[PDB]
């Protein structure tokens, strides 16, 4: 009946459809990027 | 130019063209919204 | 009790025991890298 | 999904901060302790 479900953080983590189907809501993931670089080479390697 | 590749971002973050070693850079490829589920009333 | 004489009282154990003392020393901490683009933006276009 | 409510690992990705791995792998660290145990048996025979 409430429809909007929230976690302890209080971020929205659930949605209820009119038919009552429920879809978990998860915030979009970081996909983190870091750079490995050597000054002498002057070249870099992408790091995830 | 910062907006090209992670190597370009690394130069912009440090602010030096001759970047030092150490694995320091901007992080988290911005996961752009693939779609949009606007479901209001 | 100290003795007022050339002889001195000595307290010495007639029994022995072995015990293990457990100690923890922290040599490392979790290493965290934080970026504003995912943390503060992750969209909005104008925010970027 | 999160293994537990307020899962720390899931929270890191949603925020975008990434926890870096330790410098030495667990297997290599186990080898260091095993070599130390072997040294303990005969190390205390003489100074130096």
| B8 close to B1: Cβ distance less than 8 angstroms | yes
State the DSSP H helix or E strand holding residue D13, giving kind and residue range, or none if neither. helix D8-15
Q: Which chains touch D (3 or more CB pairs under 8 A)?
A: A, B, C
* Chain D residues within 8 angstroms (CB to CB) of chain A: 1, 5-6, 10-18
The DSSP output letter for C4 is S
User: CA-CA distance, C18 to C20, in Å (whole number)?
Assistant: 7
Alpha helices per DSSP H over D1-48:
8-15, 26-43
B34 burial level (CB within 10 Å; 0-12, 13-18, 19+): exposed
Q: What is the resolution of this structure in A?
A: 2.5
Give the technique used to solve this structure: cryo-EM
The helix or strand, by DSSP H or E, that contains position C36, with its residue range, turns out to be: helix C36-36
CA C7 to centroid of chain Cα atoms: 45
C3 vs C7: CA distance, rounded Å: 7
Q: Cβ distance B10 to A35 under 8 Å?
A: yes
Chain B neighbors (3+ CB pairs < 8 Å): A, C, D
Chain centroid to CA B10: how far? Answer: 9
Report CA D27 to chain centroid distance, whole Å.
9
Q: Cα(C29)–Cα(A37) distance, rounded to whole angstroms?
A: 24
Distance from CA of D14 to the nearest CA of B (A): 10
With beta carbons under 8 A apart, name residues in chain B contacting A33. 6, 9, 25-29
Please list every residue in chain A whose beta carbon sits closer than 8 Å to the beta carbon of residue B16.
none
Interatomic CA distance for residues A44 and A39, integer angstroms: 9
Cα–Cα distance for residue pair D18/B27, rounded to 1 Å:
9
For residues B21 and B16, give the distance between their C-alpha atoms in angstroms, rounded to a whole number: 12
**Partners of A43 in the beta sheet?**
A38
Nearest chain D alpha carbon to A34: D18
């Amino acid at each position: 009946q409430q429809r909007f479900v929230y976690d302890a953080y209080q971020n929205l983590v659930g949605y209820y459809s009119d038919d009552g189907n429920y879809y978990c809501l998860r915030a979009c993931v970081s996909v983190p990027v870091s750079v490995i670089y050597d000054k002498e080479t002057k070249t870099h390697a992408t790091l995830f | 130019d910062c907006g090209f590749n992670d190597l370009s971002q690394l130069h912009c973050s440090y602010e030096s063209f001759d970047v030092e070693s150490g694995v320091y850079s901007v992080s988290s490829f911005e996961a752009k919204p693939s779609g949009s589920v606007v479901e209001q009333a | 009790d100290q003795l007022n004489s050339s002889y001195f009282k000595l307290s010495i154990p007639t029994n022995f025991s072995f015990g293990v003392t457990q100690e923890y020393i922290q040599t490392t901490i979790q290493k965290v890298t934080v970026d504003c683009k995912q943390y503060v933006c992750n969209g909005f276009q104008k925010c970027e | 999904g999160p293994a537990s409510a307020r899962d720390l690992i899931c929270a890191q990705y949603v925020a975008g901060y990434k926890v870096l791995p330790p410098l030495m792998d667990v297997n290599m660290e186990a080898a260091y302790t095993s070599s130390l145990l072997g040294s303990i048996a005969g190390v205390g025979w003489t100074a130096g």
